[PDB]
From a paper:
HG3 catalyzes the Kemp elimination, a model for proton transfer from carbon. It was generated using quantum mechanical (QM) calculations to predict an idealized active site pocket for transition state stabilization.
Thanks to this filtering strategy, only five rounds of evolution were needed to identify the highly active Kemp eliminase HG3.R5. Notably, HG3.R5 is characterized by 16 mutations, only three of which target the same residues (K50, Q90 and A125) as HG3.17. Overall, however, the two proteins have only one mutation in common, K50Q, which stabilizes the developing negative charge in the transition state. This analysis showed that HG3.R5 cleaves 5-nitrobenzisoxazole with a kcat of 702 ± 79 s−1 (mean ± s.d.) and a kcat/Km of 1.7 × 105 M−1 s−1. Notably, while the evolutionary trajectories of HG3.R5 and HG3.17 diverged at the nucleotide and amino acid level, we found that similar structural effects drive catalysis in both enzymes. The binding of an ordered water molecule in a position to stabilize the developing negative charge in the transition state is also notable. In HG3.R5, mutations acquired in the first round, such as M172A and K50Q, directly contact the substrate, while subsequent substitutions fan outward from the active site in an intricate interaction network that optimized ligand placement relative to the catalytic machinery. Noteworthy in this context is a 2.5 Å shift of the indole moiety of W87 toward the ligand, which brings it close to Q50 in HG3.R5.
Residue numbers in the entry: 4 to 303
Amino acid sequence: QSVDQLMKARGKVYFGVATDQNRLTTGKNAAIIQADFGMVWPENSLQWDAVEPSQGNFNFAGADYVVNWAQQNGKLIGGGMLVWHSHLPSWVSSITDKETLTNVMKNHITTLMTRYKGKIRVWDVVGSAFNEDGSLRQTVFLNVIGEDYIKIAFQTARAADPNAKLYIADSNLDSASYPKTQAIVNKVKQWRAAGVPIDGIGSMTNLSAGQGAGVLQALPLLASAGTPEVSILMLDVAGASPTDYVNVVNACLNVQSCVGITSFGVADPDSWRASTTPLLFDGNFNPKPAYNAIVQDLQQ
Ligand SMILES: O=[N+]([O-])c1ccc2nn[nH]c2c1
């Protein structure tokens, strides 16, 4: 059974997964994605340090591979992260001049989005803009451009490809009690009212065991920011308890604006934290209990 087809049967858009050439050409990743997932994301090959490792010298080979694979297999595509402090090459990090960085940032966004114009359902435009306490993270972008970097990034993105849904993404939004959760809500409300085209909030959902239950209330909170969409991104759960996974799926089912869920990867060995067995397929590419439990939940 296909979690993507069951999500669609329940009125959602997709169940997605992150991938890259190195996965698609190995194991059972491609076969599982074909059968079970309706949306793919280049895991790493659109991140700034991969795709623009020296300024204005882009390397699209890896991203092209995923985009072409997706098209050939009838999958939706997400891309990102366009602006993300933690995946920057050093040439970006060292810039101290506002106009310089603004133009670099605009060029980076426009170049990526125009290359695939019309093909991409979602771009994750800005990631990790908030500190844990809800303040804006003092990244090179905030420090050199100011808070306007958000507006500039999103307006640039909307100009580059108005067909795409534009998302802000952040982590540790998995509890309604966390200050970061409300902070992103109220800033997104403020920004959208000021004309910033933020179509979605994507919750990068990297959970420890037992944290799924929190998402049942965090996601409705996120949805209160009034974006047209919300989503679950980069989903993984240490231990991969069915209880945690079903909770995350149910949170999305319970939120009308939640269009879908993207898993961080297919099989545990390829996780960023493989030893925590946090994904839905084991290293033999067999579905784990949590995969079966999500299927069964969506069927009922
Ligand atoms: O949801 N995802 O797994 C995922 C992976 C990489 C990305 N980069 N930008 N957005 C992403 C989403």
